[PDB]
From a paper:
[name] (OcDH, N2-(D-1-carboxyethyl)-L-arginine:NAD+-oxidoreductase, EC 1.5.1.11) catalyzes the reductive condensation of L-arginine and pyruvate in the presence of NADH to yield D-octopine [(R)-N2-(1-carboxyethyl)-L-arginine], NAD+, and water. The enzyme consists of two domains, an NADH binding domain and a so-called octopine-binding domain. Furthermore, a catalytic dyad comprising a His–Asp proton relay system and an additional Arg-sensor (Arg324) were identified. In summary, substrates of OcDH bind in an ordered sequential manner.
The evaluation of the data clearly demonstrates that agmatine acts as a competitive inhibitor with a Ki of 40±2 mM. Since no sequence assignment could be established in the NMR experiments, we solved the structure of the OcDH/NADH-Agmatine complex by X-ray crystallography. A 2.8 Å dataset was collected and initial phases were obtained by a rigid body refinement with the OcDH/NADH-pyruvate structure as template. Already during the initial round of refinement after rigid body refinement and manual building it became obvious that agmatine is bound inside the structure in a fashion similar to L-arginine in the OcDH/NADH-L-arginine complex. The guanidinium headgroup of agmatine is coordinated via interactions with the side chains of Glu142 (domain I) and Trp278 (domain II) as well as backbone interactions with Met206 (domain II). The Cβ atom is bound via backbone interactions of Ser207. However, the binding of agmatine induces a similar rotational movement of domain II towards domain I, which is almost identical to the domain closure observed in the OcDH/NADH-L-arginine structure. This is reflected in the RMSD value between the L-arginine and agmatine structure is 0.6 Å over 399 Cα atoms whereas the comparison with OcDH/NADH complex is 1.5 Å over 399 Cα atoms. Also the structure of the OcDH/NADH-agmatine complex indicates that the binding of the L-arginine side chain triggers the domain closure of OcDH and not the carboxyl moiety of the amino acids, a prerequisite for catalyzing octopine synthesis by OcDH.
Numbering used by the authors: 2 to 404
Write the structure that this text describes.
Amino acid sequence: TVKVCVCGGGNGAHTLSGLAASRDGVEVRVLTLFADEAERWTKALGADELTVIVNEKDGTQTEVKSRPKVITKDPEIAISGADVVILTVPAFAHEGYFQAMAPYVQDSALIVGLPSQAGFEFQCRDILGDKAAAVSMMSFETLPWACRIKEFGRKVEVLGTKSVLAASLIKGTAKTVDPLSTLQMLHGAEPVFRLAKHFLEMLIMSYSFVHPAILFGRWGSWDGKPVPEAPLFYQGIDQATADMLTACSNECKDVANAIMAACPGNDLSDDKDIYQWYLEYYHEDIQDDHDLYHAITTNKSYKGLVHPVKAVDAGVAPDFGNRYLTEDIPMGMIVFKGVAIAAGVAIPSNDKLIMWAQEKIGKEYLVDGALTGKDVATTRCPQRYGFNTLDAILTGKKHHHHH
Ligand SMILES: NC(=O)C1=CN([C@@H]2O[C@H](COP(=O)(O)OP(=O)(O)OC[C@H]3O[C@@H](n4cnc5c(N)ncnc54)[C@H](O)[C@@H]3O)[C@@H](O)[C@H]2O)C=CC1
Ligand SMILES: N=C(N)NCCCCN
């Protein structure tokens, strides 16, 4: 039997619990530490099975029905004996699960971030301590599905499910169940999971700048004047924002190259241009792909997608807060900035974006190019956990003298 603990009670948690529990020889324990979400889910589901509606490419809908073994807020029941522990929650909830699982997680456990967001492994290492080197840490780029709960506890819809998805892996000393094939089995035929060469590649390939860039490209020098209605998001970018995304992406390559040169045996060559990335994973949706601007603006899976806005005098105004900034900055850009400092690589365009973004949401992470902001302890930059060197970042071991 493979024993999976699904952490969370969101769209993803519902879907993953639904899908994973439908597989033969799989036992699912749902863990959720959000107050009494666990009891609520339980009362709601009753004696029925959890239902997942999957929208196929045919336009048809397949119904998956299954039941988890237990739905609980008790980590001892959820984590003990678990072969795989999958965290599917907004990144701010990760700290709580790592803290809860710590004294119950076995050496052999595969600890999965679905999705991880940036700094997932640094946090995991810090919280689990000496147990971190034993377990394996798996980081997935994004969520496998586009999904929404329809009826809490008992029904979730997959609007679409990704064709391919990448994940990185830090192997522990303990032999886990096979990370890639086990995860694949839980998800079914799709996405077709591939293994990223190195976890830092996966972290950098998050392109945490993307959403901060887009918001800046449309609201950067915003004269305060309202607009009639929510402007297009991705499809609404101009040439300047495209260039900005190219600049940031290059800064990603810069950091990647610096690590490789300072640290032999760390293959980060799969860090590619955002433009080169778009064509790899959206080609069938892009009608005009001669450059990055056109690659993004003619992307058919970006149509109808608009900025978050709110009602103001004489029209509509950008709605910051959201998760483009409250997540992508502390759980994204800052982490990348932490690696950039450790590599010694300047990244003026990422910096430009951080400084602007944090002000919008009334947070402070970066000050004078240095990670000394008011709320820097709420981020996952490796420096926050005392991982200050590339070696510390890579291996999780601090230094270490010795009189
Ligand atoms: N289609 C989708 O739902 C997409 C979501 N994602 C990403 O995947 C991640 C998971 O997505 P969802 O499952 O939709 O997230 P969600 O927003 O549905 O998750 C809500 C869950 O977060 C936890 N939570 C909320 N407030 C909390 C609190 N203050 N303290 C402790 N726990 C709390 C609870 O368990 C709650 O059930 C997100 O980071 C999202 O950005 C990525 C692609 C698509
Ligand atoms: N890391 C990637 N390759 N893609 C990120 C998916 C977008 C999540 N906002």
